[PDB]
Every structure is written in C-alpha cells, then in structure tokens.
Design a protein around this nucleic acid. Structure first.
Ligand SMILES: Nc1ncnc2c1ncn2[C@H]1C[C@H](O)[C@@H](COP(=O)(O)OP(=O)(O)OP(=O)(O)O)O1
Ligand SMILES: [Mn+2]
Ligand SMILES: [Mn+2]
Length: 430
DNA sequence: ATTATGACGCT
DNA sequence: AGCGTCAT
C-alpha cells in the first residue's frame, strides 16, 4: 500500500555521446562528416581493430571489434580515422580531452558522475525542484521537449517516426497533472526539459551530438538512453516499467550482462526482467547472495538506490599494451624498453593531472600477462609511487615483476609476456 | 590477434 | 592486497 516504496524519489539522467570517437574525428576532419566511417587502432594486422562506428556505417553491418579489412568487405567505401600512436602504442589523449569538454559543460547544470570516457550520470532532483518553482504551475509545452521520447507511448487509438514521437509526447503531456509539485511523472518531465537544455549546450559548444535517458535511477536512465539513439533522449517513467520489463532480456540491464545474469536465467529458468517479480526477496538472496538478491528484487520493480557519486575525474590513471601472437616480449631489454614507453606516457599524463586537478598519485600498480594464460591479468603487484619520473617507475615496475621470469638465463624472458600494464592509484590532494 | 582502459566486489 | 567481474 502507501507504505510501499516505489523508488520515485530521485530524478536521474544518463548522458552518452553518439559514436563518440567518430564524432571527435569528424569535428577535426570535415571530410569524414555524414559518411560511413570508423575509428581504428593500429593497421598492420588485418587493417587494424575498429573501436567506434558511425551510424551510416552501422547500416552496412560494421561493428566494434571488427577488423578493418573485414569491415571493408561489408562496406567498401568505409572511411577510417586512426588512433594516434606515441612511444610505440595507441594514445587516447585526444578522446580524453574531448571528454573533458563535455564533462565540464554538464557540470554547469549539476554535479555529475563520470561513468566512462563518453558518459555521465546526473542527479537532477534539486534542479527539477527549482525549475518547478519558477514555472509556478504552468503546463510544459511540447516545444520544450523537441527531441524527447516517452517510452511506452503512444498506446491504443502514425506511419512516420517523428509523428510517432510527437503522438506519444502529447499523450504524456495531456495526462500530466502539474498542480502537484511532488508528482514523480511531472518531476521526470521537467528533468527531461533540463536535459534538452544540457544536450543543446553540449552540441552548441562542442559540435558533438549525444543521447540521454531520464528516469528515477541510474539503471533505468542508462536503459532509457539507448532506446532511441542517436541524437534523441528518452523518458522512462515508473509506470512504464512493467510493460518494458515484460519482454526485456535480463542481460540488457547493467551488471547483468555477464555471469550473474546468465546464472539468473539458468537457475530460475526465466528470460525477461519482469519474470523476476514472482520470487521473494529471500528466494533471490538464497540464489545470488544477500546484496544481489535485494538488488534484483527491487530492480525488477524499477527500483534502485545507487547514488550519483560526485566524481568527475577518473580515480586511476593507467597505461597498457598487449603483445599478441609472435610479438610477445621474450627478452629482458624488450620488457625494459616497453616498460619505459608505458612509464613515459604515464609520467606525461600524471604531470598534466597534477597541474590540472591538484592531486598526486601515491601507488603504482604493475600488471602483466604471460603466454598461455587466458586471464586478462596473470599477476598484479603494487609498489610505492614517490616521484613522477618514468625511468624510476619503469625500473620499479621491472623490480616487482622480474622474478616472474622462469628462464634460468637472465637475458631471455620465459614464458613470453603478452601484456604490460602500469596504473597510478591512491590519489592525495596537493 | 576483440585493444585500451576504468570502477567496484570478494576474501 | 591480489584477484575477479562487468563495463565502455
Ligand atoms: N571495448 C572498447 N574498447 C576500446 N574503446 C572503446 C570500447 N568501447 C567503447 N570504446 C570507446 C569508443 C567509443 O567511441 C567510446 C564510447 O563508447 P560507447 O558509448 O559504448 O559507444 P559509442 O559512443 O561509440 O556509440 P553509441 O554510444 O552511439 O552507440 O568509447
Ligand atoms: Mn556513446
Ligand atoms: Mn558510453
């Protein structure tokens, strides 16, 4: 009844850039604009690996993780932009700096949580309360929501997509009761108005387009954002959840895309998120543990409480490189050379970070992978990070890993290393 | 030879 | 702490 929490206390948005690395390259090179194009790293092995794809190219079936040579088979006129290489490795600085552009604009509207290089969550609860006050009981015009979808609408008693968007929007608005300053649906709508403003600002000031989801929590906001990309935003109301989840594969929900989600499906013998409602909290806790069980019980009802953390900057700064196949490092000075290259990029990014953000990393994590292992990281060791100097860091990294070498000979490295990883962690204010 | 990251959970 | 999971 009225005691039952419905998880409608917050207004949360997720803003995610469209085809982000592609857009970064398209802004820089006008020739790539409005074309099937993709961003690739490296070149020698099968044309390089694709990590971002324009929507024009997606129509041909081009995807992430596809080799460029294979993508060219689906899309002969596919244009390609290469990730910069520095010190023998891919360097993502251009995209990180483009990310900062967007993050700083979003921060003008509310405190954000950086969730990836191209997306951030927004807690709009306070901002919505203040827009509602200066509205002072005026209806929200559809003109204020020019790119907004309302999930689940229209319904009941039409052949074009923009026409459908508007029909759904008018059904939504004409059902809104704005007399109520605590109405969750009204609060979401105002949230959507603000996000329209945010997204306009991002495009105006960077040239980048993005999509967004507006709901009552992070999981629903993330799900919403993807429903109508690119260059659109979607509102998922609490009321839309039963229909939405009744046919929603469990793997589509954030954190359930892996082994846990597979276990939910296998153990319970279900396919869709909505089917979870038929289990007690204790039942779910028994199968998936106390934390996961409570989380699942609430989530399948559209309820989740993970807060938007006040964190705009990444907590770690890392440098990594794979050495696949026959390129695996088999000599000590090979290992030492590449540790230096990684450490030099790390020092560069660390020094920039210290100046920009008034902080200093205090711990260096070293990770390697060995030939034969299917694990991402065969070993992780930490040591102290007392100075921002590449030679010191690479020498220290070598020290903490050098006895991983099985080889009785000290000049040769056995078994060959197929990955190196340097990560600066544990920041302190400075 | 699906690369380069980055956050959070478990024990 | 070191490892595993999930993620973009
Ligand atoms: N697995 C990955 N490996 C390396 N880089 C990645 C990977 N996934 C994503 N990226 C980079 C490239 C992307 O442009 C950027 C944003 O990722 P993501 O939001 O998932 O897709 P996207 O922005 O390229 O397209 P869209 O969000 O419109 O579907 O992060
Ligand atoms: Mn994106
Ligand atoms: Mn993203």
């Amino acid at each position: 009844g009225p005691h039952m929490a419905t998880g409608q206390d917050r207004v949360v948005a997720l803003v995610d850039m469209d085809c982000f690395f592609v857009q970064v390259e398209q802004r820089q090179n006008p020739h790539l604009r409005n074309k099937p194009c993709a961003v690739v790293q490296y070149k020698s092995w099968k044309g390089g690996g694709i990590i971002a794809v324009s929507y024009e190219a997606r129509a041909f079936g081009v995807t992430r993780s596809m080799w460029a040579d294979d993508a060219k088979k689906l899309c002969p006129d596919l244009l390609l932009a290469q990730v910069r290489e520095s010190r023998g490795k891919a360097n993502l600085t251009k995209y990180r700096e483009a990310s900062v552009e967007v993050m700083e604009i979003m921060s003008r509207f509310a405190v954000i949580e950086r969730a990836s290089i191209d997306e951030a969550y927004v807690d709009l609860t306070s901002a919505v309360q203040e827009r509602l006050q200066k509205l002072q009981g005026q209806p929200i015009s559809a003109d204020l929501l020019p790119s907004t979808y309302i999930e689940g609408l229209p319904q009941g008693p039409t052949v074009q997509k923009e026409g459908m968007r508007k029909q759904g929007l008018f059904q939504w608005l004409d059902s809104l009761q704005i007399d109520n300053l605590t109405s969750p649906d009204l609060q979401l709508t105002v949230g959507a108005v603000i996000v329209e403003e945010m997204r306009a600002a991002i495009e105006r000031e960077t040239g980048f387009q993005c999509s967004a989801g507006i709901s009552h929590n992070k999981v629903l906001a993330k799900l919403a954002c993807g429903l109508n990309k690119p260059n659109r935003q979607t509102l998922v109301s609490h009321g839309s959840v039963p229909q939405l989840f009744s046919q929603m594969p469990i793997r589509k929900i954030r954190s359930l895309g892996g082994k846990l989600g597979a276990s939910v499906i296998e153990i319970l013998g279900i396919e869709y998120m909505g089917e979870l409602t038929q289990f007690t909290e204790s039942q779910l806790q028994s199968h998936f543990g106390e934390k996961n069980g409570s989380w699942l019980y609430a989530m399948c009802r559209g309820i989740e409480h993970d807060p938007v953390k006040p964190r705009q900057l990444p907590k770690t700064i890392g440098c990594s490189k794979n050495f696949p196949g026959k390129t695996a490092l088999a000599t000590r000075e090979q290992v030492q050379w590449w540790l230096l290259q990684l450490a030099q990029e790390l020092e560069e990014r660390l020094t920039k970070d210290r100046n920009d953000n008034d902080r200093v990393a205090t711990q260096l994590v070293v990770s390697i992978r060995v030939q034969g292992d299917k694990r991402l990281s065969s070993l992780r060791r930490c040591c102290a990070l007392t100075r921002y100097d590449a030679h010191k860091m690479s020498h220290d990294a070598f020290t903490v890993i050098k006895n991983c070498n099985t080889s009785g000979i000290q000049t040769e490295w056995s078994p060959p290393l197929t990955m190196l990883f340097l990560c600066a962690t544990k920041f302190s204010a400075s």
